[PDB]
DNA sequence: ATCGGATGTATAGATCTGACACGTGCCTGGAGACTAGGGAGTAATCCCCTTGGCGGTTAAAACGCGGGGGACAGCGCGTACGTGCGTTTAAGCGGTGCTAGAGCTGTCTACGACCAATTGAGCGGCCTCGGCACCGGGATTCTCGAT
DNA sequence: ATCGAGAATCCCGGTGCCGAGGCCGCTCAATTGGTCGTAGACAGCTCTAGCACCGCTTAAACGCACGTACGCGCTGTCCCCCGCGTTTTAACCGCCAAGGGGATTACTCCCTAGTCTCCAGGCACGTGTCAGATCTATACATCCGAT
């Protein structure tokens, strides 16, 4: 079964990390990644760097674990990179708090909300399933998508973990029809259609991976081409999988936050409600308010608004 | 010489042709149109008058009165349809009684 | 100098019943009937001419107006009588 | 003495008035009613005699037609007597109101 | 100056008899007066309006015939 | 089990077909009927699809109006079922008979 | 073409009655309303075909049907 | 020749006046048509259009629909008494019928 | 080209936006509005033509259209229509 | 009124898309500006016909009973029509292929508008007499108790 | 369950009487010739949408098995609308007056048809910009059989 810090002590390794720098309960189930489950209280399990892990935290430490031994230093580095631990959240909160008193009020109660370094492919298809949907549902869809087309890893209790599907697999024959039986709705083709476009028209995996060196403007532009990947989804990918920290998603949640917490309204736009250019304007508004890491500040308020 | 006699009619072709133009029903009017209209008017008048004369003779009267016209109109299922939504003044109604009203035997 | 069709209705009555008369009280109904039928036919002929973007009222227009207004059995005889009259008028 | 059973005299006068062609309505009360109604639309209105006569003929023709329709409704409802339900059913189905 | 009561009870009975009716209820004797008033108002409205357009002060029979024809109840015998 | 009472699945779908705005009759059977009727007046006639649609819509409106009048006539006779006698009564009152 | 009035099935009549506010249906209603529909369609199609023939055409357009319904007393909006 | 100004705007109108005047000329209604008659008629037409469009917009707002469909037009006509009287003999294409059920048909409690 | 076919679409759209500046209208509704305005135009014009013939007149002035409006439009609808139409005619006469 | 199943609506970290809105090219129908003549407004006037009045007359409307027959409520029966479930079926949709005639243009003709002269017909106007309404007497049809 | 008394309604005969209809003058509109202008009859060409077929999906029609609610026949009650006698009252009906307004005549003057330039409002068409719908799970709200 799933390990716990108390049951198999000699299988856990720690990483210096204060709760002020990271709160797993505020990051893993908040819509960034849909692959983590609190199988046991305060213990989150999921796939990280092609293998299963269980993570749990004390006050100043982040504890990590057919493994038959404690995580190695090399493996632990995989975890630090996933949580981008070289970035000091305390410095970011300070800055955002200094230029936005509302953020300061919220930030007092929701510390440790950071951003996850992610894999481009997993991020692209998970958010293609994020559209017009709720986190609870999205989570199920992504799980069934991985069980059906992803590599089988290991089994803990009655849970069999799977790696994320490859482009070749998602581009396979009759994938759409399968995913509709798996309840993906119309997003089923979006998945099939985007895998093929990438493989047969954009120059495969290399095309998506190269975007990480490209500019936010370029990257976002490149992604909007893919079926199911309009402005909100593209920004999600840029921010969470392509290292574009200034990329601000503009969903219903950030729509409400802007309105009630900043009394914001479109000025350059035409419409008074959500539209492609009002959404674009809201994004710039947040960028001019918080700066270069505006997307990360967005992640904090979004997580807090879920609560 | 008269266009009524020349067409073998009794209704005035000239008068119908005047009324057709004065009434400005269209910019122009044909020559056979008043003749055709006069013929139709004559035939309808003959039909009404023939049934009215029969109805008047049925009641031993050699003079036609509006009651005879109403009886003749209502006794023909085609002419009644043609004049379904119109009233003959002092024409009365068609005598009928529903069978339920009639006394028990 | 009002104008009425009393003379023509009387002539038709003499043709259909040589020995029966008509009261002027009903002859007024005859006038108001022939005038009403004339108005009802010419109105449909005017609409026909305007419908087909035409500007002339012809025998075809009157015949179609008759075919539209009068019911089956009466309209067949009306059309036949009008056709005979216009045929005779053209032949003479 | 001699008393007619009810209904037989009520079936009589039906024949009499169907064969009849008079107006069945007193002329002066109707003329005064027409003038009274015309006051609501204009003061000091004159009427030709034939105008009042034509209004009378049209009004009674309409009333007789309405009564025929209500009679059809009355027999239809397994009844013999007219009720205001019949007046209103006939007016509504005919489209008047 | 109420004059609708001039349409008496026996005249209403006579009209119903011509309609072909055996028995009449009491409430008819006012319901049909109301109906007749409504119809007369509707017709005389158009008649008086025609008289206004023609700028006369007498209501001719021809105006009544026009008004009745406008409502679909054409009348023969006056014009 | 689970069985509904006969009064419910009537008012249900009465609300539905008063809210909704379909044509309620399959298009092709009505088209063939129109063709067959038009055969008697002229042979080898060709109907514009809009003409068939207009005929269908007008027939639907006429039949719904007739059914409203039929329902009123049925309710007048202390009945909730429409009988044919209701249909010819409504047609007779309206003036189609 | 023959025997096409049966194409208007009993469920179609039921749906029409339900739209018309009718709660419950007898048995002879279907035959009676098929007869009524035949009569009404004959009345409108005769005038439509007459309108078409007067224009020397072999195609019955929606415009002629609209004019015929206007004469019949329905004055259908929408089409043209 | 001065600056061209339409007769519809001279009268402060929206419906056209020249078009209505031409239609009156070409409809063979009378030999001559007065100058003010097309203006009046256009005013009446625009008022009626504004009335029906007001009712249709209210019905559409009640149904939370931004655009106006024939169903809203038919419902607006049938709800208002005066317009229903004006358009009693007129069928709206795919307009539907006014929702109503007779009180007798409703179930007993 | 498909010939000059003269429709009231633009005028109806202008009125609709002057009444509710944020509501669109479908093509079926414009077709219905076009048929409606053509129907009312034909009705009023025919009635006014009948008035012109009755009074043995020869022209259709404003007051025949006024009378036709009072015959056709029911009650307060006719009242409002006459009032606004006379407003428009006075505005036009004041150039 | 209460309660557990059936339905119905709002919503959920967006996206697509057939329909609509809008911009623009381009003409053709609306405007501006003149004249011409006649339709309509206006002043004067005359008759007639609608309004108002009075007095006799009596037909018809109001009123009051007696009663009986028809509306109405209740009630039992029975059956037929609503409802649900499984089984055909042909409606509907997408696609392809073909051509009948709908819809335009082009030309020229013959058919109707229009005007001048002519003449007869069908409209007021007037006078007669016979078809028809009315009164009364008598023959005989339906109704309603007697038996 | 079929006859007389009694109204009641035709049949017939006499008796006025006032419209129906036959002449008569006439004058204004129908008829006839002739000229000129353009609506459309006839030819001809394009293309489009109506028809015809065909394969596949699947919502919808059909048929059969229930079972309970509604149509209908039957009884009993009571009430209110008939038929009829009696009283009144207001409508008919014959006069009278009388003057308001509808029709008619003769100016006369502005108002709209007709025509010729001249131009921008609206139509046709080509791109942006979207409101409705979207698969399905879920959180409620709402209705309905059973209690």
Q: For residue A131, which nucleotide's C1' is closest to its Cα?
A: J14
| Experimental determination approach used | cryo-EM
Q: Is C72:B48 a contact under the CB 8 Å cutoff?
A: no
Domain limits for position H14:
1-108
Instruction: Tally the residues of chain D.
Output: 97
Enter the CATH code of domain I1-95: 1.10.20.10
3-state helix/strand/coil string of I27-72: HHHHHHHHHHHHHHHHHHHHHHHHHHHHCCCCEECHHHHHHHHHHH
Distance C35 CA to J121 C1' (A): 21
Q: Whole-angstrom Cα distance, residue D82 to residue E25?
A: 6
* Residues in Cβ contact with A266 at an 8 Å cutoff, skipping those fewer than 6 apart: A272, A277, A278, A281, A282
Distance CA E30, CA E51 (A): 31
Q: Are F83 and G30 in contact (CB under 8 A)?
A: no
Resolution for this PDB entry, in angstroms? 3.3
> Taking CB atoms and an 8 Å limit, are E74 and C36 in contact across chains?
yes
Q: Is the CB of F8 under 7 A from strand K?
A: yes
The H-or-E segment that residue I84 falls in is: helix I76-93
Which residue is listed with tokens 């629909």?
A: H65
Q: Nearest residue of E to residue B86 by CA position? A: E74
Decide if D76 and F78 are in contact by the 8 Å CB cutoff.
Answer: no
Distances in Å between the Cα of F11 and the Cα atoms of A303, H63, H107 are 48, 22, 9
D near E: at least 3 beta-carbon pairs less than 8 Å apart: yes
Half-sphere exposure of A106 (CA within 13 A, CB side): 20
Query: Hey, where are the domains in chain E?
Result: 1-78
Q: Terminus-to-terminus CA distance in chain B, angstroms?
A: 68
Q: Establish if H30 touches chain B: CB-CB under 8 angstroms.
A: yes
How many residues make up chain H in this entry? 109
Contact present, H and I (at least 3 Cβ pairs less than 8 Å): yes
E60 CA from K103 C1′ (Å): 14
CA atoms within 13 A on the CB side of A105: 5
Domain ranges within chain C, ordered by starting residue: 1-92
Say which residue the tokens 């072709």 belong to.
B13
Token reading at C64: 């179609």
Chain G contact for F32 (CB, 8 A cutoff):
yes
Closest to A119 (Cα-Cα) out of A195, A54, A25, A33? A33
Contacting residues of C for H28, CB less than 8 Å apart? 46, 50
H32: left (phi over 0), alpha (psi -120 to 50) or beta: beta
Structure tokens, F76: 């007048």
CATH 1.10.20.10 fits G1-79, yes or no: yes
CA–centroid distance for G14 within its chain: 17
Chain K bases under 7 Å from protein CB?
6-9, 19-21, 28-32, 39-41, 49-51, 60-62, 67-72, 80-85, 90-92, 100-103, 111-113, 118-125, 129-132, 134-138, 144-146
Q: In angstroms, rounded to a whole number, what is the distance separating the alpha carbons of residues A7 and B54?
A: 119
Q: Give the CA-to-C1' distance from D2 to K5 in angstroms.
A: 9
How far away is chain C from the Cα of B74, in angstroms, using its nearest Cα? 15
Q: How far is I49 from chain E, CA to nearest CA, in Å?
A: 13
Q: Which nucleotide is nearest to A133 if distance is taken from CA to C1'?
A: J12
Q: For residue D78, which nucleotide's C1' is closest to its Cα?
A: J71
Topology (CATH level 3) of domain A120-241? Endonuclease III; domain 1 (1.10.340)
> Which two tokens mark A273?
């409600």
CA dihedral over F65, F66, F71, F75, signed as positive or negative: positive
Q: Residues E55, E56, E57, CA angle at the centre, nearest 5°?
A: 130
Chain H window 23-42: residues with CB closer than 7 Å to nucleic chain J are 32
Classify domain C1-92 at the CATH topology level.
Answer: Histone, subunit A (1.10.20)
The domain tally of chain H equals: 1
Rounded Cα distance, F22 and F25, in Å: 9
> Which chain A residues 152-171 have CB under 7 A to strand J?
none
CA distances from A122 to A145, A251, G20 (A): 11, 20, 56
Any atom of strand K under 7 A from CB of F79? Answer: yes
Q: Which residues pair with E74 in a beta bridge?
A: B86
CB of residue D7 closer than 7 A to nucleic acid strand J?
yes
**C56 Cβ within 7 A of any nucleic strand K atom:** yes
By C-alpha to C1' distance, K5 is nearest to D2
Contacts of A187 by beta carbon, 8 Å cutoff, 6+ apart = A128, A129, A131, A133, A141, A179, A228
Q: Does any CB of chain B come closer than 8 Å to the CB of residue E22?
A: yes
For chain A, the domains span 9-84, 120-241
- Side-chain-side CA neighbours of residue C55 (13 Å): 5
Contact B16 C46 (CB under 8 A): no
Distance from CA of B66 to the nearest CA of H (A): 33
Domain topology for A9-84: TATA-Binding Protein (3.30.310)
- Cross-chain CB nearest to I62 (options H36, H53, H90): H36
B22/H contact by beta carbon, under 8 A: no
Mutation pick from C6, C8, C54, C68 vs chain B, by most beta carbons of B within 10 Å, is: C8
* Contact yes or no for I30/I12 (Cβ under 8 A): yes
Strand partners, A45: A37, A54
Nucleotides of J under 7 A from a protein CB: 5-6, 8, 10-16, 19-21, 28-33, 39-41, 49-51, 60-62, 66-72, 80-85, 90-92, 100-104, 111-113, 120-124, 131-133, 143-145
CATH number corresponding to E1-78? 1.10.20.10
Residues constituting chain F: 97
Q: What is the DSSP string of chain A?
A: ----TTT-GGG-EEEE--TTT--HHHHTTTTS-S--EEEETTEEEEE-SSSEEEEEE-SSEEEE----SPPPHHHHHHHHHHTTTTS-HHHHHHHHHHH-HHHHHHHHHSTT-------HHHHHHHHHHHTTS-HHHHHHHHHHHHHHHSPEEEEETTEEEEPPPPHHHHTSTTHHHHHHHTT-TTHHHHHHHHHHHHHHTS-HHHHHHHTTTS-HHHHHHHHTTSTT--HHHHHHHHHHHS--TT-----HHHHHHHHHHH----SSSS-SS--HHHHHHHHHHHHHHH-TTHHHHHHHHHHHHH-
Residues 6+ apart with CB under 8 A from A87: A114
* Nearest in space to A116 (alpha carbons), one of A84, A163, A138, A76: A84
Here the tokens at position D8 are: 């037989």
Phi, psi (rounded to 5 degrees) for F46: -120, 120
Residue pairs between chains C and E whose CB atoms are closer than 8 Å: 12
Structure tokens at I87: 């407003």
Asked if strand J contacts G61 at the CB level, meaning under 7 A, the answer is yes
Q: How long is the CA H65 to C1' K142 vector, in angstroms?
A: 23
**Could you tell me the sign of the dihedral formed by the alpha carbons of A263, A267, A271, A274, in that order?**
negative
Q: Does B27 contact H30 at a Cβ distance shorter than 8 Å? A: no
Cα–Cα distance, I39 to F42 (Å, whole number): 30
CA distance D90 to chain E (A): 12
* G79 interfaces chain F, CB cutoff of 8 Å: yes
Task: Give the minimum alpha-carbon distance from H3 to chain I in angstroms, rounded to a whole number.
Answer: 14
Is the C-beta atom of D16 closer than 7 angstroms to strand K?
A: yes
Please tell me whether any atom of strand K lies within 7 Å of the Cβ of D9: yes
Contact between A4 and A43 (Cβ < 8 Å): yes
CA distance I30 to I38: 12
Instruction: Look up tokens 């097309």; give the residue.
Output: H38
Helices C6-16 and C24-51: crossing angle in degrees, nearest 10, is 100
**Measured in whole angstroms, how far is the alpha carbon of residue D55 from the centre of its chain?**
13
Q: Are A48 and A64 in contact (CB under 8 A)?
A: no
CA I56 remoteness from chain centre = 25
- Note whether I14 and H42 are within 8 A (CB): no
Nearest nucleotide, CA H33 to C1': K112
**What is the H or E stretch that residue F47 is in?**
strand F46-47
């Amino acid at each position: 079964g799933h390990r716990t810090l108390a049951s198999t002590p000699a299988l856990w390794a720690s990483i210096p990390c204060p709760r002020s720098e990271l709160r797993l309960d505020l990051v893993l189930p908040s819509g960034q990644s849909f692959r983590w489950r609190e199988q046991s209280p305060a213990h989150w399990s999921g796939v990280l760097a092609d293998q299963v892990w269980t993570l749990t935290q004390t006050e100043e430490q982040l504890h990590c674990t057919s493994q038959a031994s404690r995580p190695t230093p090399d493996e632990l580095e995989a975890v630090r990179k996933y949580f981008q631990l070289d970035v000091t959240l305390a410095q970011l909160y300070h800055h955002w708090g200094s230029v936005d008193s509302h953020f300061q009020e919220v930030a007092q109660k929701f510390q440790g909300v950071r951003l996850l370094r992610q894999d481009p492919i997993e991020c692209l298809f998970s958010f293609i399933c994020s559209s017009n949907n709720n986190i609870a549902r999205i989570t199920g869809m992504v799980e069934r998508l991985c069980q059906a087309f992803g590599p089988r890893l290991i089994q803990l209790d009655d849970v069999t973990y799977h790696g994320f599907p490859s482009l070749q697999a998602l581009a396979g024959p009759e994938v759409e029809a399968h995913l509709r039986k798996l309840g993906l709705g119309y997003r089923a083709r979006y998945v099939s259609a985007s895998a093929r476009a990438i493989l047969e028209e954009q120059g495969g995996l290399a095309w998506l991976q190269q975007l990480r060196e490209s500019s936010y403007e370029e990257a976002h532009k490149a992604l909007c081409i893919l079926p199911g990947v309009g402005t909100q989804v593209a920004d999600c990918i840029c921010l969470m999988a392509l290292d574009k920290p200034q990329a601000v998603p503009v969903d219903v949640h950030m729509w409400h936050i802007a309105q009630r917490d900043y009394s914001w309204h479109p000025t350059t736009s035409q419409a008074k409600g959500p539209s492609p250019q009002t959404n674009k304007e809201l994004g710039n508004f947040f960028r001019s308010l918080w700066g270069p890491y505006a997307g990360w500040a967005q992640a904090v308020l979004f997580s807090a608004d879920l609560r | 010489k008269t266009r009524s006699s020349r067409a073998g009619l009794q209704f005035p072709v000239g008068r119908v042709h005047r009324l057709l133009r004065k009434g400005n029903y269209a910019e122009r009017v044909g020559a056979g149109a008043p003749v055709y209209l006069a013929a139709v008017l004559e035939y309808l008048t003959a039909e009404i008058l023939e049934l009215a004369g029969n109805a008047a003779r049925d009641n031993k009267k050699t003079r036609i009165i509006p009651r005879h016209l109403q009886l003749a109109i209502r006794n023909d299922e085609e002419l009644n349809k043609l004049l379904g939504k119109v009233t003959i003044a002092q024409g009365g109604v068609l005598p009928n009684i529903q069978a339920v009203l009639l006394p028990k035997k | 100098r009002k104008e009425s069709y009393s003379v023509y209705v009387y002539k038709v009555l003499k043709q259909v019943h040589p020995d029966t008369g008509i009261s002027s009280k009903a002859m007024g109904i005859m006038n108001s009937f022939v005038n009403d039928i004339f108005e009802r036919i010419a109105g449909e002929a005017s609409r026909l001419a305007h419908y087909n973007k035409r500007s002339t009222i012809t025998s075809r227009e009157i015949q179609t107006a008759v075919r539209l207004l009068l019911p089956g059995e009466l309209a067949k005889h009306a059309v036949s009588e009008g056709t005979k009259a216009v045929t005779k008028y053209t032949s003479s | 003495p001699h008393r007619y059973r009810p209904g037989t005299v009520a079936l009589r006068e039906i024949r009499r008035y169907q064969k009849s062609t008079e107006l069945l309505i007193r002329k002066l009360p109707f003329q005064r009613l027409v003038r009274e109604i015309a006051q609501d639309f204009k003061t000091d209105l004159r009427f030709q005699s034939s105008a009042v006569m034509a209004l009378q003929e049209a009004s009674e023709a309409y009333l007789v037609g309405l009564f025929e329709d209500t009679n059809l409704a009355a027999i239809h409802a397994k009844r013999v007597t007219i009720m205001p339900k019949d007046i209103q059913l006939a007016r509504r189905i005919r489209g008047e109101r | 100056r109420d004059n609708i009561q001039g349409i008496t009870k026996p005249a209403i009975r006579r009209l119903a008899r011509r309609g072909g009716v055996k028995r009449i209820s009491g409430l008819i004797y006012e319901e049909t007066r109301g109906v007749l008033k409504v119809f007369l108002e509707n017709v005389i409205r158009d008649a008086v309006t025609y008289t206004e357009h023609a700028k006369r002060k007498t209501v001719t029979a021809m105006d009544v015939v026009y008004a009745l024809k406008r409502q679909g109840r054409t009348l023969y015998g006056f014009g």
